[PDB]
Ligand binder design. Structure first.
Ligand code: CL
Ligand code: CL
Lengths: 226, 226
């Protein structure tokens, strides 16, 4: 059975995780894990309560690891236990993946050094200090690393992983069973297509978080430099 | 504060719920509820464990009610307590909404009689016996009723509700903050675009469920006829 694991941490952006989880859990001969320091309740940034199913120590070797983003990424970038777990699993995983600011966690773990990668538009400047080659594209592949932008990035890349783990017909069947054919009613999902006034509002609202994450990123980079 | 409620039931398709939940919870001056017979754990069809936050009796009057779909819809179509709750809230709600097979629950509650509506493609034949005018479109509005197809229908219609509860700039800001710009890697999300061989596989896999739901639908229709 293919072993797929998601890191589930306090203040996760739950949709980053729950989207790909429901797609991948629809496949035959998969087992999906929600991983934290111990099994039990973990609260997402919205207040939604989720349950982790396994600890770091008990998690099986994973074929796919996925790091979601969220407010809680800042703490995870300086959590040595979590970073060590991610490094251990990434060494043998067939696919190392992240959604949105989850790639900053991969960066803090040292897994983006010399690699092409993306992250959420408001935090994109933090990739270069973590050793990455920053790329402004929605899904960026480099070897076995996939990084994606947007809260639903993992839904789309989960279909790619289904096609490569199984075959294209299986991915198409899952897409049809879920009737997945999005059609957003607005076109403001990128800073290049949203109105300038909306981009300004969004940037202002992210400014305090960006400032705090600049500080965290520099400390994380210092650890990689040692 | 705008009061938004999702029905959370055993064997729900969790993404039907968790998608719109994370979008709507991003708005100012909203409160989001996860409603079941009592607060506590509810298991989705994938095994993901979610927590209901309020009971039917304690739920405040809702401005928006949303019924997700999933395997568990069949039981809900014959749950008199749940159907009565939905009818009570729908009487005063500004928006009555559903995702995928959640519209079959609205149908069983009597709320689609004479109304245009859609549902999941494999179960679309069950709308007419529940009194609906079946429509093959992804989002169907009739008055204050919105029904949508696809596992992520609620993400898209949540942006429409944001624009109508607040304004277009607020909806655009949420879209940009979430960097929401989907781009599926396959085009098999409708029976009209998927390969015929894939449609056959999907229809065969749904056949037992459709048969069982034909029986449930006829009993639900008999109750409406009384
Ligand atoms: Cl997206
Ligand atoms: Cl969809």
């Amino acid at each position: 059975a293919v072993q797929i694991g998601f890191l589930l941490f306090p203040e996760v952006q739950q949709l980053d995780l729950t989207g790909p989880h429901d797609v991948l859990a629809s496949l035959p001969d998969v087992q999906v894990h929600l991983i934290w320091k111990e099994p039990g309740p973990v609260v997402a940034s919205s207040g939604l309560v989720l349950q982790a199913t396994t600890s770091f120590a008990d998690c099986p070797p994973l074929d796919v690891i996925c790091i979601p983003g969220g407010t809680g990424v800042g703490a995870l970038m300086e959590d040595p236990q979590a970073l060590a777990f991610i490094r251990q699993q990434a060494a043998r995983a067939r696919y190392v993946t992240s959604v949105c600011t989850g790639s900053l966690v991969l960066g803090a773990a040292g897994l983006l050094q010399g690699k092409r990668a993306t992250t959420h538009w408001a935090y994109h400047e933090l990739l270069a200090p973590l050793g990455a080659i920053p790329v402004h594209e929605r899904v960026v592949r480099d070897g076995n690393l996939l990084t994606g932008t947007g809260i639903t990035a993992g839904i789309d890349f989960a279909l790619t992983l289904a096609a490569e783990l199984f075959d294209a017909a299986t991915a198409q069947r899952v897409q049809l069973q879920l009737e997945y054919a999005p059609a957003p009613p607005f076109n403001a999902g990128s800073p290049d297509t949203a109105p300038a006034s909306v981009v300004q509002q969004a940037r202002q609202r992210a400014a305090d978080s960006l400032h705090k994450r600049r500080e965290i990123t520099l400390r994380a980079a210092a650890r990689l430099a040692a």
